[PDB]
Amino acid sequence: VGACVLCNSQTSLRCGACIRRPFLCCKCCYDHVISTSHKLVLSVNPYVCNAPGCDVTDVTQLYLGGMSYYCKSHKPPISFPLCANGQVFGLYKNTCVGSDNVTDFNAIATCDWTNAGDYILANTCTERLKLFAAETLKATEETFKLSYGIATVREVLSDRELHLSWEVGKPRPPLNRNYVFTGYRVTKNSKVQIGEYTFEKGAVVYRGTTTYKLNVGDYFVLTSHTVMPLSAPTLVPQEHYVRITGLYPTLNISDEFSSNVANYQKVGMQKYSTLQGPPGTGKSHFAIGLALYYPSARIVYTACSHAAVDALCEKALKYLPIDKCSRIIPARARVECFDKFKVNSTLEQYVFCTVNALPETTADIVVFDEISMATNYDLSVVNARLRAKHYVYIGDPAQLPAPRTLLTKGTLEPEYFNSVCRLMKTIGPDMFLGTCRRCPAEIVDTVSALVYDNKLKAHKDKSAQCFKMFYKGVITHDVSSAINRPQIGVVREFLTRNPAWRKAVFISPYNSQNAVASKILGLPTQTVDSSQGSEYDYVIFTQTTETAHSCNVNRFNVAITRAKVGILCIMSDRDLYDKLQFTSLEIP
Ligand SMILES: Nc1ncnc2c1ncn2[C@@H]1O[C@H](COP(=O)(O)OP(=O)(O)NP(=O)(O)O)[C@@H](O)[C@H]1O
Ligand SMILES: [Mg+2]
Ligand SMILES: [Zn+2]
Ligand SMILES: [Zn+2]
Ligand SMILES: [Zn+2]
């Protein structure tokens, strides 16, 4: 027994065909079952024909007789429909209102999440539906991981190398660092977890959360996480204040964070505040300075990726007392991340943690950085677990989004990423930093006229070290990713002529190209995903292919805006090459 998801009308009915089983009132249950393929209803007992040897679970055929339910063919003459005239028989069959926006609920519950419009509706609906939509999406995504087959240990070559065998009749997941597996040891009458594992193609290379000596017969499946019911909203009700509440501002502040003191005051004058900033404009710098303006306040810094949280940790290292910081890493995951703070010291003034690894705790201010990669599920988790006085949502909708791996056909705008990005595109951000304080003028001019509507201002001047070369090269593939060796050879010859560029960071859309360029060039390699929130003096980027993946403007924007001094872009698509306001080089 619970509350309807479309009315809040008390009811005992749930839809069994919905993969989330939401409470539905008598009218809503009727409105849903008559217009969709969903016909199973769950009350105290599932509505099913009490006739011996009958299968009818469809509520549209069932009738009530005494204390049992019968189908259309096994019903007595005096028997009444369970679902008729617009309602469904159930507890509280009389406190049933009826929603006007049930058309939305039907589309959300029945869509496969392969079109952008399915995600548009999941962000433009009511708040009660946003939580439901995020549950259905995450459950759909987690259910789609079961379509891949099991991988078992066939042969152990060494430690960091394996031979795998694949469960028949099912496809194989892509082998790279993005996809994390779980290993199991087969016991007598059960199965026990061995840790976390990731695989790459050399015979496969492996790294584990443990040093376990995996033997033949152990198996790996994509790590699936529990979909939790969402209670707290994506955004709490907005409260505006008349003075600063709960916080005591500092008397003297450093000259770096002096330009944000007006915005820092606005943070403490309202329940939640949004800061939109183009790349390299000081959004994360804004977040760490907030701690210095409210020295007594306890701030929780969170983001959706371990990379973005590490970026905040690096800045916090420079500006905050190191003995007041902590990095929250989840139990028994090796995944290498910033360990210059105390690890898993939840009761510190400053806490740096990932969204899905958040502990249930209070804070004075909550800072959510890189908001473009967030989802409504993430926003709900943050309000659920972190109870704070102030919520600061920081990010750039024109940077990396959350991976919507089931989204296939169509283009989703940044305005439909999540409810916080929805505010930034409609009513505007509460705060805004419009001056890029990191990249040279050539990069800023490129991204300003490319994606930021010529509204991005540069603080740095032309460094004259931003170069672009047009070489398609030779594209070679292994399964998921791709490799362009001639484009790497261009960098190799370039690296001799510019010896100040072998400390540079190599960026590429494909991480097989990263591995190949790491072996031949021997440079530090970062993916666009792994470079988020980070800045490097010199960046070398090879586009590798002209595929739709490599030509993504947001992905391309993030990659080239990582450089603070110089960048070299080996482009394959002339459309993006000509839109680069760099200096062109000549072929040898
Ligand atoms: N007021 C400031 N004083 C000194 N350095 C600053 C200031 N604002 C920004 N910077 C520097 O400019 C760079 C950009 O800041 P940062 O906060 O990392 O960018 P960002 O807003 O997070 N862009 P992104 O990587 O998309 O998150 C960093 O090197 C900062 O140290
Ligand atoms: Mg940032
Ligand atoms: Zn349903
Ligand atoms: Zn209802
Ligand atoms: Zn029957």
Numbering used by the authors: 2 to 203, 208 to 593
Sentences from the paper on this structure:
A nucleotide bound form of NSP13 with the ATP analog AMP-PNP was determined to 3.0 Å resolution in a monoclinic crystal system with 4 molecules of NSP13 in the asymmetric unit. In the nucleotide bound form, AMP-PNP is bound to all 4 molecules in the asymmetric unit but in two distinctly different modes. In mode A (exemplified by chain A of the nucleotide form) both AMP-PNP and a hydrated Mg2+ ion are bound, with the adenine base making stacking interactions to H290 on one side and R442 on the other. The β-phosphate is situated directly within the phosphate binding motif I and makes interactions with the main chain amides of residues 287–289. The γ-phosphate makes extensive interactions with the sidechains of Q404, R443 and R567 (from motif III, IV, and VI respectively). The Mg2+ ion is in an octahedral coordination and makes direct contacts to both the β and γ phosphates as well as the side chain of S289 and additional three waters. The conserved D374 and E375 from motif II (walker B) make further interactions with the waters and are poised to perform their presumed catalytic role of activating a hydroxyl for nucleophilic attack. In nucleotide binding mode B (chains B, C and D of the nucleotide form) the interaction environment of the adenine base and γ-phosphate are largely unchanged, with the ribose O2 contacting the side chain of K320. No density could be observed for Mg2+ ions in these three chains with the sidechain of S289 contacting instead the α-phosphate and the residues from motif II more distant. More directly related to the nucleotide status is the relative conformations adopted by the 1A and 2A domains which shifts by around 20° and adopts a closed conformation the Mg2+ AMP-PNP bound crystals structure, and a more open conformation in the APO, Phosphate bound and other AMP-PNP bound chains.
The SARS-CoV-2 Non-structural protein 13 (NSP13) has been identified as a target for anti-virals due to its high sequence conservation and essential role in viral replication. NSP13 is a 67 kDa protein that belongs to the helicase superfamily 1B, it utilizes the energy of nucleotide triphosphate hydrolysis to catalyze the unwinding of double-stranded DNA or RNA in a 5′ to 3′ direction. NSP13 contains 5 domains, a N-terminal Zinc binding domain (ZBD) that coordinates 3 structural Zinc ions, a helical “stalk” domain, a beta-barrel 1B domain and two “RecA like” helicase subdomains 1 A and 2 A that contain the residues responsible for nucleotide binding and hydrolysis. A long 30 amino acid linker that does not adopt any secondary structure links the 1B to the 1A and 2A RecA-like core helicase domains. The nucleotide binding site is situated in a cleft between the 1A and 2A domains with specific contacts to the nucleotide provided by conserved helicase motifs I, II, and III in the 1A domain and IV, V, and VI in the 2A domain.
